[PDB]
Amino acid sequence: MLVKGNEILLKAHKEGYGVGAFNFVNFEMLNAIFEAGNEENSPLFIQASEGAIKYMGIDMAVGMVKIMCERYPHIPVALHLDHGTTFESCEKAVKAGFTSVMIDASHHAFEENLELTSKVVKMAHNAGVSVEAELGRLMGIAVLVNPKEAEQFVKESQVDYLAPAIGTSHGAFKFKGEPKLDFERLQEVKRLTNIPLVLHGASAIPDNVRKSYLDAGGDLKGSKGVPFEFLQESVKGGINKVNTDTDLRIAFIAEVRKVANEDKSQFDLRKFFSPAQLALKNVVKERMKLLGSANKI
Amino acid sequence: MLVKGNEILLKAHKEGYGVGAFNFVNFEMLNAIFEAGNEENSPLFIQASEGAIKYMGIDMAVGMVKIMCERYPHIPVALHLDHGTTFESCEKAVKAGFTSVMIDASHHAFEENLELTSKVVKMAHNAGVSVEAELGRLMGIAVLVNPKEAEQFVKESQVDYLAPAIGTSHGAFKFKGEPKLDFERLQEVKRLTNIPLVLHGASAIPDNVRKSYLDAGGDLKGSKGVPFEFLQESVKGGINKVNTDTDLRIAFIAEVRKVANEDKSQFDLRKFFSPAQLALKNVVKERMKLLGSANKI
Ligand SMILES: O=C(COP(=O)(O)O)N(O)CCCCO
Ligand SMILES: O=C(COP(=O)(O)O)N(O)CCCCO
Ligand SMILES: [Cl-]
Ligand SMILES: [Cl-]
Ligand code: NA
Ligand code: NA
Ligand SMILES: [Zn+2]
Ligand SMILES: [Zn+2]
Predict the structure, then answer these.
(1) Neighbours of ion ligand 6 (CB under 5 A)
(2) How many CB atoms lie within 10 A of CB A140?
């Protein structure tokens, strides 16, 4: 059922697995993510960014998720506001029925980030909603999370989970040269905070997905994601929520491109989007197995 | 808000205009249809085929429509089961919260049609839901509607509206040679029944929509829809519900193709589906003005 984020992530923290947190912008993405969760017996974080909420309407974002949760009541699901940028944004999400919100003030000075995050936490905790915040700057290897800052930040804000920057970045172009992450830094943050941790920019760009996209005439020149083995290492190091969006998009649109390329007379939407859903579903299912949330219901 | 189909079509019948009935299969189509209704200040029939209901799930089909009705509470909307094929299908729709169902047994012999239609009407009227039936086979120019058949059919079945076959057909390829419809037959049917009438296969395939689809590499060789003038003539003749599906799909997919063509690196779903929604919304807006439902709220 729909539950507070911390219920799902505290279990993952206790047992040492990671739970994929998958973004959606419409019904097709949402359906595919739920079907994957049902097929792999996995709990789900379902995420909507502020841009996604504007596209859908916050009423429809929550409404669709509630319908899906009733379709699959045995699956623990948290509905999460990804990259909330203001107190008001988080407040609106809480009011609409989100069960988890991220307040992202990572680019503010430490004390400003802490003050804003603390303000969101007070509001969200009053409403039974969990909160994520961020420290460090998301970019490839000051910059990265400062573990002693994290220790103080978490203690003083009472935030439920923290996203520490350890060398990932958003999007399909995460690394020029060989992938590298600061796992020692991650482990120190985990020791000092002892809460669930969140990895942003965690898409892998898997080989089969890249191949699907390129085969359909797509251009992914230069793209590189987080290696599977690095995602596993991150979970061993204390990551329990693994934000994944780009992988889902590439897989889905590859299938849309393929149909568009091949059958010029095709305009039945379902013929584009059924294959697109299937590819997205399969990406999510494999990722659930990789991170270890498979079979945790 | 969500109202019985007859509430909308009786007003159309009384005041002599047509109300477009638009199919959807997902959030994008539905959102575009509602935004059109809102901008044109027009009542809406929103319909879902059994195929669309399979694709979405009936819980999601109805659920999304209810959320949209809450978003635009001032718009009269009927949620209509398009081409229901069995009593059980119509019953499932009624229980799920549809406010209008079509029982399509036009392929049965006249008395089989009447028997089945009468059973559906009894069940539907008992639940405050309106009913559409059909007489004639839906091909171009025995087959077409027999006005005397219609007279008896309506009086004894108590069906709320009737779809008489007068020369239209489903899909992009309605006519070889210049379009022709049997408006005399239409007018006779209206005179004998004096209820709201429904035109199926009413897509026009507008020049600008064709142009968009062809420009994006699509193939629509040999396609022809109902001329705008003919739709206007149908409404003058007593058509109050005008089923439109193909026009919407082509305009939508034309934009998806264009996006795929113009940027091989593009895989943000919103970048595909925002232009698609806009093209679909514009088709609907123009159709509402054409049929005369603009400003009828
Ligand atoms: O942390 C996440 C996931 O990042 P990604 O899926 O690109 O690895 N996000 O904030 C999503 C951003 C998508 C980039 O355009
Ligand atoms: O009457 C119609 C629509 O007719 P059109 O194909 O002209 O849009 N419908 O009932 C919708 C489904 C038919 C498939 O196209
Ligand atoms: Cl940030
Ligand atoms: Cl039929
Ligand atoms: Na997040
Ligand atoms: Na119909
Ligand atoms: Zn992120
Ligand atoms: Zn039809």
Answers:
(1) B 82, 102
(2) 17
